[PDB]
Design an enzyme around this catalytic site. Structure first.
Site, mmCIF file in Angstrom:
data_model
loop_
_atom_site.group_PDB
_atom_site.id
_atom_site.type_symbol
_atom_site.label_atom_id
_atom_site.label_comp_id
_atom_site.label_asym_id
_atom_site.label_seq_id
_atom_site.Cartn_x
_atom_site.Cartn_y
_atom_site.Cartn_z
ATOM 1 N N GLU A 132 10.046 -6.967 -1.588
ATOM 2 C CA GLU A 132 8.521 -6.994 -1.545
ATOM 3 C C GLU A 132 7.970 -6.190 -0.499
ATOM 4 O O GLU A 132 7.157 -6.753 0.204
ATOM 5 C CB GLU A 132 8.059 -8.474 -1.615
ATOM 6 C CG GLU A 132 8.083 -9.388 -2.687
ATOM 7 C CD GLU A 132 6.943 -9.289 -3.835
ATOM 8 O OE1 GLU A 132 6.574 -8.020 -3.625
ATOM 9 O OE2 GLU A 132 6.745 -10.314 -4.305
ATOM 10 N N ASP A 133 8.099 -4.865 -0.817
ATOM 11 C CA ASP A 133 7.533 -3.738 -0.133
ATOM 12 C C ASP A 133 8.161 -3.690 1.623
ATOM 13 O O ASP A 133 7.530 -2.897 2.161
ATOM 14 C CB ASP A 133 6.092 -3.812 -0.079
ATOM 15 C CG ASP A 133 5.528 -4.108 -1.474
ATOM 16 O OD1 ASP A 133 6.113 -4.024 -2.324
ATOM 17 O OD2 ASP A 133 4.074 -4.469 -1.367
ATOM 18 N N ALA A 134 8.881 -4.678 1.750
ATOM 19 C CA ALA A 134 9.355 -4.385 3.221
ATOM 20 C C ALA A 134 10.363 -3.450 3.531
ATOM 21 O O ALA A 134 11.077 -2.920 2.336
ATOM 22 C CB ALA A 134 10.005 -6.064 3.538
ATOM 23 N N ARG B 145 5.761 1.405 -9.144
ATOM 24 C CA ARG B 145 4.509 2.262 -8.632
ATOM 25 C C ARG B 145 4.324 3.624 -9.139
ATOM 26 O O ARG B 145 3.556 4.266 -8.849
ATOM 27 C CB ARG B 145 4.208 1.978 -7.123
ATOM 28 C CG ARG B 145 4.717 0.557 -6.543
ATOM 29 C CD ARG B 145 4.529 0.711 -5.110
ATOM 30 N NE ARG B 145 5.301 -0.440 -4.402
ATOM 31 C CZ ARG B 145 5.007 -1.810 -4.810
ATOM 32 N NH1 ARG B 145 3.739 -2.052 -5.557
ATOM 33 N NH2 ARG B 145 5.484 -2.719 -4.250
ATOM 34 N N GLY C 14 4.767 -1.182 4.095
ATOM 35 C CA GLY C 14 5.185 -2.295 4.105
ATOM 36 C C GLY C 14 5.558 -2.785 5.624
ATOM 37 O O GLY C 14 5.588 -2.042 6.655
#
Ligand SMILES: [Mg+2]
Ligand SMILES: [Zn+2]
Ligand SMILES: [Zn+2]
Ligand SMILES: [Zn+2]
Lengths: 49, 56, 196, 378, 49, 65, 900, 77, 244
Positions: free
Chosen positions: I199-201, C43, C11
């Site tokens: 969100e994956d940040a 995940r 990310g």
């Protein structure tokens, strides 16, 4: 000589750019492989001589 | 009678284009807004002169 | 800037938070990174948690933790030595908020995870073109970022602009900003007239 | 409030017919529960009318583009791979108007005399089921002393086909008049009339196997399921014409996956309805909800000319009146050359042609016409 | 690195998927994404040619 | 390639005691006790000292001018 | 004045038209001399246009960059059959008599076909069907109805070879090669009255024009020549093809003028025909494509027009645009859904052209006086006459002093400016929306989180593009139509698309769960963070240790409108008795007392009365995507602006809740006690015993074939069913032994992120790994791996993983999971291309459909596709769960409004 | 026998009169060539006994509107 | 087949030759392969339930008196291709060997590739996650080469303070990743912080960045050639005059 001792080598230097030859997963030469085509309803054997 | 979204967008675009090259505003202005904002306030005040032609 | 863990967790940086605003544990440790808890179980990434526990254990003991496949240090053994080191088995630590200063109601899981910076930096990925060079053939903006090229408005973008019903926006995008030109047309036969 | 007053108010309301009856039924249901007053019912009708007016689609909406996007977007998250071949391949097969879909499956419904007991359902399934003697055969052996096939079949399979061996012989005695068929217990032995060459033996042995003893051609597997205390037969292959006229099968509910068979048997309207139902079922199987209006518009566009047409270069885009619309999508060179041969005139009434040229598209704000009064005096 | 002569756009369900003979010869996890998945593999650590 | 001056977490100076830590590690002693006697108690500073590897000596050999 | 292209008429270019349109005649097969100047009479002649800046065009007198280019003509020595029309030519050769030239149909048939052509109208399919029928009828007639001359069959050889089947005096059948001159002579005899029968225009598509006698060489501009970095000019493929064509034509002319024998002339004619065929289309079947000296095949006009990289798709349908940026996106909950984070560097580069009026004169003057290097500033200034001047340091004050009404100033991007925000691929119309510019000094784009599900964008290195409209009409269209808050509801399913996700759902659950109370300082802080206009704190719900406490439901109630009442069940329902009691209590009174509701309030039943959250916990069913009932009701009953404000406030409030209360996941979230592990191991042993028993029964022959199935797949299906039951039992045990206090369980149950199976896979088992819907079988003979005995059909030897992620998988089970993951990845990588192709096909099939003002959907031709869109004239975006009007919701809301 | 209109997939079909056809043309302001087409060999057409040149009025079940009225034009194959 | 295998184990013939036997009820065949392109793996020969590799061989390997080629020479460990392994029954672990087992796996962790072994505990992660981690291991930045400063690569990256991971597989030491690390160890706390890690940040520490954590340098190399054209014309390396 300006070379990294940890460099594995195994590549080519063409026009000052390092070139690596990726191996190719091909069929066995001079070997006949047999399979059946369901759509064609036939038995087919192929050899790459 | 009601204005559709496409008709409202077309009216606002035409009014903003008119204001950009003339067509002085019929209402007061906040002294610094863009012509699009001027058209938006003109629509909000119900003072727009542009009508919509509909087939019949 | 893209940062990725070794277990597929990747990310970009969302915020550069000052140290005074970052939370800290009861042992006086301020994390160097903060990740969302939503990404860990979705995940199915338990190896990241095991690596965090092993990194904390290795830092506290001074001995590197083996992470080899199928012959690595067992997770339960790592939790055992973490307990023997004076920390919680789960790796959770009591943390205080950096802004309010109050104790958090939940024990936060903090550990050492190997995070690598990738080459997909925002410095080499930002592109901004207003006007500039155009192609000699189509009179359209060039390709890529090295020659100050434009951004492609593909067929799908045109389709969704049609679906939005924005006719004039599509006209401005595809025509008035890319290859607008004027030609002379003969009304008698429709051929392209020549201007001398 | 009496029921007559509620009915009169519903009738006087400016609402569609389907909304009127549902609203009246709901008002009747809620009237005994809460004792609604006349003004409350009138306000409910007014609110329903206002909601219906608000729900009306504004003119100029790109319904075709929105429908195409709303159908293709869930296909990016579908799942690939009895034998219903559902998912993205099923949608692709449906929209491409495939004459023979992969693994065709027909849904067969039975009448009141066969939908309540298992024996009648099994017997009518075996009537539908096309069983050949090659499947009934267990061992394959061609000899030389009599120079013909001596067929031996297992009895257990004959316990499922529901017919005797001797009657089986009756299925090839009339059909194959050039050979003599004999039955020896559970063994089938054929005899040659005038056969002396091996070439003609291989030109007549396969004809027996390809011959169908009972059932319908193109029918493979057949299963029976219990749904809604009713027996439903699901078969493999599409034989709608030969399965509609079956003594024991209800023909008012039978359907098949082959939309072309429904078009050629039940009409183009039933083909459009079947296309809509198949797309809806395929979308619901994957768990992705798509509004039925998009599917209905797609099916209406597919069956506009009275025949089922695909969405490719040989379908809806193929019969497009615009030359540039056909050239931009597929087979650009030959379409343009054929247009040059025919001297076709493109009126540029479409969207893609105006996109290519630079004229405003005839959708959305491109259809809005404006009028202006010149003497503006602020 | 090992590549394959098969086209990248072709759906090769029987070729892109992992095989049981890849144990000890082809890495089971390190594969690229997109059209290059399956057709491009890497030699295992114990692989000998 | 060279040891960082301060710990990345709290800014505690560790470059002064890194070479002593490396010398004691090469002598066969337990690195945990070496970190303990050097005042490196927080595991973030221990992370910085343990995970660092010296590589500048292999870069100085390649002259650039 | 100004004119637009009303219609386009297509046809075949006549040789006279080609000669008239040509400004030069080309005979030299060369481009440039040694010094680089163009050669007179060559392809690079100045009469056809100029590319090099120094040169000036001879035909129009304009320099490079403004000369449109002029066509040329080449007079071919012999006619050459055009390949694109070639097959069509054969059709005409099968339709017209070889002597009279008329069609091979009777006068009555001709007249009847004329009436058929006139009657049917303008549908293309009927015209092609009639043309095919006429050609089939005429091709089977060997006697001309008008002249009586015998006819011979004509065999067409690809691409441009015609054979006539003739008979000698001895009756022998031979093939005569029809030269293009003979074909053109035969085509010239067809009158104009028979052309409509052949599908040819009498005045636009004469058949003799289908054989090329004059070749139109393109202008210099359309095939430009560039100079490489090595000083050697790089010619185009079309230029090389034309050089070859000119050389072959010159050789043919020289040989014809020299009286060469017939062997020479036909050979050179065939060479010229091949060259022209490759020039029209280099990918023609049956011929070798034209190749460069380096072995690279050339792409001619046909490849320039067709294909993904062709002019139609790569340059006309879609093309690169100006005033666009593209960079990485990062989260920004602090901005509204209407706003986009624009970097300062991007803002100072992209410019909005604003005309100077009487109200923005001072602002634009200040923008000009700031300059391009100072924000907010300007980059360019356009006078009313139309000269654009770039603002530098020297003329920055001079242009500002010269600014007047009517001038245009390309100012920097300011706050409130409307720009487009698009992420590729654009699968739906919601993939681009018009946001408001927010300028921040960092480098990356910033987009609000609820707008991410419309874009299908996460923040793992996602790249997004931004487009700045220039004209006022485009800006107005973006602001009105494609604004973000106007597209909250997805038209695909009529449900909320712009909605809270992940941490929003988790924070809503944490705030609205039972027993969640906050102090006065916390309540004030979250009210300030969410930007709510709460001037005074509400009455505290309870007092603990002498301090006031506020329930999270009370804080959540301030977001909802004061006249809102809705009840439903969420995903947190596991005791239906309490939900049934709440439903019954609501059903009787229809205005239940808030004290009565709070007595039996349940987190599994959301009930809001007059804007007060009396019961229920917030989850994905509240304001999540495709599931949020509360957001759906708020959008439909209170507009989009109020819905946008509510969404922003609730997202900020939930972010504050999840930030300070503490949300985390650890390795003990998947931890299970010894009893759960023992139960899982017992289930494992039972499953393996059942699989072994099934294998033994199949081996001993007492296994029963399934109806229509043999032993193998029946046994495989039974084993897979047994493994599925074992997996379900293990998941049920894991769910039983994992309470609601677990944060991962909270995320799975509330619908924020992940699923129950994800927690099961990390705690209980991995299940059975399957490929293509069946058990793993690819590998060695009789086995997948060599660590199992050959012919083993057991669970462990076929991909059934017994351990979970926490316990670690065996190397064989790790390999099986690798096969499963590879199969999944290949499945997505294959599905994406097919889905995109199907989307493109559907779009091109339905691009022109539009609802008219009478509610009918019609094609551009005029055929009524639908007399009413969706058979009711209702937008799916405005539809209520696929229905026309939600009578239940309307009745309930109106009844509550009148009762309250 | 088996009537084709008894099938649940087959909607109701009716023959439009000349006056009704003219009213349909007037209502939507379209010509006879702008209507949807139906083949003369369609089983519904041969069940109704129609001939090319007529207009078939289809009462179809509507999932969104209950009942819908479509119109088709009989054309030759 | 047994005689050929015994001769190969005795060192009489080369290790390239691989022999396999296919014994079906219908056909029987023997295959001998000695050509190129055959990917093989080393396996310890197990006879009568006892592996050929003993503690003495390991001691000789550790002492340096015995090499890998020496171990191949005595037939203790043999290279098996896909054809021969069809006749082999491999044991995953040294404690799982039985009388019916024919081979013993040397290293089950060696089935992964070089970048895939960088992932610590890959069996505890999902397969797509392991694939992503292996793919992104090649995109990391670090001191890949000690001679990076003298190299003329068109694009390159350098980490200011690269660190060897504290949780690393033992193969990475043998591969050489410890000598050339491509990342740093981060003190990561899993927590929701103001929605900026959504969100994956990720959220990074400002003081950590200012202290040199994850600092990188990007090198770009440009080339200029004084090319000579026809007729003696050539480029010149000089500051251009404003008049041109
Ligand atoms: Mg992404
Ligand atoms: Zn520290
Ligand atoms: Zn010119
Ligand atoms: Zn004639």
């Amino acid at each position: 000589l300006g070379e990294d001792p940890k460099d594995p080598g195994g590549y080519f230097i063409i026009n000052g750019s390092e070139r690596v030859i990726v191996s190719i997963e091909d069929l066995a030469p001079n070997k006949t492989l047999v399979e059946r085509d369901e759509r064609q309803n036939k038995v087919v054997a192929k050899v790459f001589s | 009678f009601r204005y559709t979204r496409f008709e409202k967008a077309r009216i606002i675009g035409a009014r903003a284009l008119q204001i950009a090259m003339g067509a002085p505003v019929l209402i007061d202005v906040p002294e610094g807004i863009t012509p699009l904002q001027a058209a938006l306030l003109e629509f909000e005040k119900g003072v727009i002169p542009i009508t919509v032609i509909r087939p019949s | 800037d893209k940062f990725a863990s070794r277990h597929g967790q990747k990310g970009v940086i969302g915020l550069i938070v000052p140290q005074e605003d970052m939370p800290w544990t009861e042992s006086g440790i301020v994390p160097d990174l903060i990740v969302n808890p939503h990404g860990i179980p979705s995940r199915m990434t338990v190896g990241q948690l095991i690596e965090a526990i092993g990194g904390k254990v290795a830092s506290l003991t001074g001995r590197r933790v083996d992470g080899t496949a199928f012959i690595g240090e067992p997770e339960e053994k790592l939790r055992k030595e973490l307990e023997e080191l004076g920390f919680k088995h789960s790796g959770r630590e009591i943390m205080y908020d950096g802004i309010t200063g109050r104790r958090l109601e939940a024990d936060i899981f903090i550990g050492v995870i190997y995070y690598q910076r990738l080459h997909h930096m925002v410095a080499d990925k930002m592109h901004a073109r207003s006007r500039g060079p155009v192609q000699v053939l189509t009179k359209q903006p060039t390709e890529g970022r090295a020659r100050e090229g434009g951004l492609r408005f593909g067929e799908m973008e045109r389709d969704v602009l049609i679906g939005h019903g924005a006719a004039m926006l599509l006209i401005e995008r595809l025509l008035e900003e890319s290859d607008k030109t004027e030609v002379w047309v003969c009304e008698s036969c429709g051929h392209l007239a020549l201007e001398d | 409030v009496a029921e007559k007053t509620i009915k009169s108010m519903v009738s006087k309301a400016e609402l569609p017919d389907n909304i009127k009856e549902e609203l009246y039924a709901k008002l009747i249901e809620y009237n005994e529960k809460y004792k609604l007053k006349k003004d409350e019912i009138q306000a409910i009708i007014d609110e329903t009318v206002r909601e219906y007016q608000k729900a009306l689609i504004e003119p100029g909406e790109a319904v075709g583009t929105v429908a195409a996007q709303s159908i293709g977007e869930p296909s990016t998250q579908m799942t690939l791979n009895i034998n219903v071949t559902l998912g993205l391949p099923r949608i692709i097969e449906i929209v491409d108007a495939r004459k023979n879909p992969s693994t065709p499956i027909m849904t067969v419904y039975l009448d009141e005399e066969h939908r309540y007991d298992r024996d009648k359902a099994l017997e009518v399934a075996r009537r539908i089921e096309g069983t050949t003697l090659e499947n009934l055969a267990r061992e394959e052996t061609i000899d030389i002393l009599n120079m013909e096939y001596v067929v031996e079949i297992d009895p257990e399979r004959l316990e499922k086909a529901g017919l005797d061996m001797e009657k089986v012989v009756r299925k090839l005695t009339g059909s194959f008049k050039s050979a003599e068929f004999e039955a020896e217990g559970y063994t089938l032995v054929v005899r040659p009339k005038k056969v002396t060459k091996l070439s003609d033996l291989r030109k007549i042995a396969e004809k027996v196997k390809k011959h169908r003893l009972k059932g319908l051609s193109g029918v493979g597997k057949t299963i029976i399921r219990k749904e809604g205390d009713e027996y439903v037969i699901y078969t493999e292959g599409s034989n709608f014409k030969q399965v509609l006229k079956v003594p024991g099968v209800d023909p008012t509910r039978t359907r098949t996956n082959n939309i072309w068979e429904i078009a050629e048997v039940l009409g183009i309207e039933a083909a459009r309805n079947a296309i809509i139902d198949e797309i809806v079922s395929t979308m619901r199987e994957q768990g992705l909800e798509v509004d039925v209006r998009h599917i209905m518009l797609v099916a209406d566009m597919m069956t506009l000319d009275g025949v089922i047409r695909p969405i490719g270069r040989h379908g809806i885009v193929g019969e497009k009146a615009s030359v540039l619309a056909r050239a931009a999508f597929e087979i650009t060179t030959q379409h343009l050359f054929a247009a040059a041969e025919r001297g076709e005139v493109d009126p540029l009434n479409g969207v893609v042609e105006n996109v290519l040229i630079g004229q405003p598209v005839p959708v959305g704000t491109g259809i809005v016409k404006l009028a202006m009064s010149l003497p503006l005096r602020p | 690195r090992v590549t394959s002569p098969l086209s990248r756009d072709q759906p090769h369900f029987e070729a892109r998927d992992l095989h049981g003979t890849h144990w000890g010869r082809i890495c089971p996890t390190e594969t690229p994404e997109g059209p290059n998945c399956g057709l491009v593999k890497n030699l295992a650590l114990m692989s000998q040619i | 390639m060279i040891v960082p001056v301060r710990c990345f977490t709290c800014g505690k100076v560790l470059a002064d005691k890194y070479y002593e830590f490396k010398k004691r590690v090469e002598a066969g002693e337990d690195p945990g006790k070496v970190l303990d006697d050097l005042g490196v108690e927080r595991y973030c500073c221990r992370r910085t000292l343990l995970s660092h590897v010296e590589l500048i000596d292999q870069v100085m050999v390649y002259k650039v001018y | 004045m100004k004119k637009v292209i009303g219609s386009i008429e297509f046809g075949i270019l006549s040789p006279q038209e080609i000669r008239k349109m040509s400004a030069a005649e080309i005979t030299v097969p060369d481009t440039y001399d040694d010094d680089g100047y163009p050669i007179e009479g060559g392809l690079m002649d100045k009469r056809l246009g100029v590319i090099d800046p120094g040169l000036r065009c001879e035909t129009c007198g304009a320099r490079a960059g403004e000369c449109p280019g002029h066509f040329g003509h080449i007079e071919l020595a012999r006619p050459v059959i055009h390949v694109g029309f070639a097959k069509t030519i054969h059709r005409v050769l099968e339709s017209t008599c070889r002597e009279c030239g008329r069609i091979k149909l009777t006068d009555e048939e001709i007249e009847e076909y004329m009436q058929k052509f006139e009657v049917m109208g303008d549908r293309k399919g009927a015209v092609d069907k009639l043309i095919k029928e006429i050609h089939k009828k005429a091709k089977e007639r060997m006697v001309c109805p008008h002249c009586g001359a015998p006819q011979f069959p004509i065999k067409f050889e690809r691409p441009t070879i015609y054979w006539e089947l003739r008979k000698d005096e001895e009756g022998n059948e031979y093939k005569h090669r029809m030269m293009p001159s003979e074909v053109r002579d035969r085509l010239e005899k067809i009158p104009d009255k028979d052309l409509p029968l052949l599908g040819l225009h009498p005045e636009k598509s004469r058949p003799e024009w289908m054989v090329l006698t004059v070749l139109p060489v393109p202008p210099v501009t359309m095939r430009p020549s560039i100079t490489l970095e090595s000083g050697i000019r790089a010619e185009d493929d079309l230029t090389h093809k034309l050089v070859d064509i000119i050389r072959i034509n010159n050789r043919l002319k020289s040989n014809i003028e020299a009286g060469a024998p017939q062997l020479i002339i036909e050979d050179l004619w065939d060479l010229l025909q091949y060259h022209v065929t490759t020039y029209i289309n280099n990918e023609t079947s049956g011929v070798p494509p034209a190749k460069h000296k380096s072995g690279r095949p050339l792409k001619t006009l046909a490849q320039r027009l067709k294909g993904k990289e062709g002019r139609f798709r790569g340059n006309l349908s879609g093309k690169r645009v100006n005033f666009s940026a593209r960079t990485v996106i990062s989260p920004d909950p602090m901005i509204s859904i209407n706003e986009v984070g624009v970097p300062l560097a991007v803002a100072m580069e992209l410019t909005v052209p604003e005309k100077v009026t009487e109200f923005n004169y001072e602002k634009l003057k200040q923008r000009v006086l700031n300059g391009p290097e100072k924000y907010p500033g300007a980059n360019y200034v356009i006078d009313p006459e139309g000269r654009r001047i770039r603002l530098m340091e020297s003329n920055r004050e001079l242009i500002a002093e010269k600014l007047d009404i009517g001038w245009t100033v390309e100012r920097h991007l300011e706050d409130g400016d409307v720009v487009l925000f698009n992420r590729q691929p654009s699968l739906h119309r919601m993939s681009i929306m018009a946001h408001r510019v927010r300028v921040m000094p960092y480098r990356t784009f910033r987009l609000n989180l609820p707008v991410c599900p419309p874009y299908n964008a996460d923040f793992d290195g996602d790249e997004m593009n931004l487009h700045v409209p220039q004209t006022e009409e485009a800006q107005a269209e973006a602001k009105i139509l494609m604004e973000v808050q106007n597209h909250i509801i997805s038209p695909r399913y009529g449900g909320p698309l712009i909605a809270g996700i992940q941490d929003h759902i988790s924070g809503g659950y944490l705030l609205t769960r039972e027993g969640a109370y906050f102090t006065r300082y916390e309540v004030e802080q979250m009210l300030m963070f969410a930007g709510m206009d709460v001037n005074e704190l509400p009455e505290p719900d309870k007092y603990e240790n002498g301090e006031p406490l506020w329930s999270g439901k009370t804080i959540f109630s301030l977001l909802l409108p004061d006249d809102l009442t809705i009840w439903y069940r969420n995903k947190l329902c596991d005791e239906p008795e309490r939900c049934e009691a709440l439903e019954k209590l609501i059903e009787e009174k229809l205005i239940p007392d808030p004290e009565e509701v709070r007595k039996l309030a349940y987190d599994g039943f959301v009930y809001i009365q007059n804007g007060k959250l009396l019961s229920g916990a917030v989850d994905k069913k509240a304001y999540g995507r495709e599931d949020g009932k509360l957001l759906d009701i708020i959008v439909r009953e209170y507009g989009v602006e109020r819905a946008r404000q509510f969404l922003d406030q609730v997202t900020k409030l939930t972010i504050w809740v999840i930030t300070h209360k503490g949300f985390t996941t650890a390795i003990d979230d998947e931890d299970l006690p010894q009893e759960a592990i023992d139960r899982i191991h017992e289930i494992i042993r039972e499953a393996e015993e059942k699989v072994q028993r099934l294998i033994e029964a199949y081996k001993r022959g007492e296994l029963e074939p399934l109806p229509g199935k043999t032993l193998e797949e029946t046994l495989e299906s039974k084993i897979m069913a047994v493994l599925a039951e074992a997996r379900d039992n293990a998941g049920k045990v894991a769910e039983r032994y994992l309470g609601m206090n677990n944060h991962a369980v909270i995320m799975a149950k509330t619908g924020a992120r992940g699923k129950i199976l994800n927690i099961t896979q990390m705690a209980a088992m991995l299940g059975q790994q399957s490929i293509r819907g069946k058990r793993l079988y690819r590998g060695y003979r009789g086995r997948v791996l060599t660590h199992f005995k050959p012919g083993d059909l057991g669970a462990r030897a076929r991909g059934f993983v017994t351990n979970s992620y926490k316990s670690g998988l065996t190397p064989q089970e790790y390999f099986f999971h690798a096969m499963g993951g590879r199969e999944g990845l290949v499945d997505t990588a294959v599905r994406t291309a097919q889905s995109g192709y199907m989307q493109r096909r559907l779009i091109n099939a339905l691009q022109d459909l539009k609802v008219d003002y009478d509610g009918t959907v019609r094609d551009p031709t005029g055929i009524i596709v639908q007399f009413k869109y969706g058979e009711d004239g209702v937008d799916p975006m405005k539809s209520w769960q696929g229905k026309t009007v939600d009578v239940d919701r309307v009745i309930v809301r109106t009844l509550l409004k009148m009762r309250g | 026998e088996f009537n084709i209109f008894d099938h649940v997939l087959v909607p109701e079909h009716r023959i439009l009169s000349e006056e009704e056809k003219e009213e349909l043309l007037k209502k939507y302001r379209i010509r006879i060539s702008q209507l949807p087409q139906i083949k003369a060999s369609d089983p519904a057409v041969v069940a109704l006994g129609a001939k090319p040149g007529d207009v078939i009025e289809i009462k179809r079940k509507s999932p969104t509107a209950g009942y819908y009225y479509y119109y088709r034009l009989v054309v030759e194959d | 087949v047994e005689r050929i295998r015994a001769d190969r184990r005795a060192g009489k013939i080369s290790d390239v030759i691989n022999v396999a036997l296919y014994e079906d009820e219908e056909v029987k065949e023997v295959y001998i392969n000695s050509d190129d392109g055959r990917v093989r793996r080393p396996l310890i020969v197990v006879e009568n339930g006892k592996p050929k590799l003993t503690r003495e061989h390991v001691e000789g390997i550790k002492n340096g008196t015995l090499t890998w080629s020496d171990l191949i020479r005595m037939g203790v460990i043999e290279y098996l291709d896909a054809e021969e392994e069809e006749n082999a029954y491999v044991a995953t672990w040294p404690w799982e060997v039985t009388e019916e087992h024919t081979h013993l796996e040397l290293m089950p962790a060696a089935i992964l590739g070089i970048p895939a072994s960088l992932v610590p505990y890959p069996e505890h992660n999902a397969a797509p996650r392991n694939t992503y981690g292996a793919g992104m291991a090649k995109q990391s930045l670090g001191l890949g080469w000690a001679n990076f400063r003298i190299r003329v690569d068109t694009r390159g990256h350098l980490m200011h303070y690269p660190q060897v991971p504290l949780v690393n597989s033992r193969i990475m030491k043998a591969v050489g990743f410890e000598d050339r690390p491509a990342g740093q160890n981060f003190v990561v706390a899993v927590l929701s912080y103001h929605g900026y890690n959504m969100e994956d940040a990720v959220i990074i520490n400002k003081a950590s960045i200012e202290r040199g954590l994850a600092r990188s340098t990007f090198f770009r190399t440009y080339e200029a050639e004084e090319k000579r054209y026809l007729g003696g014309q050539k480029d010149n390396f000089e500051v251009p005059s404003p008049n041109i």
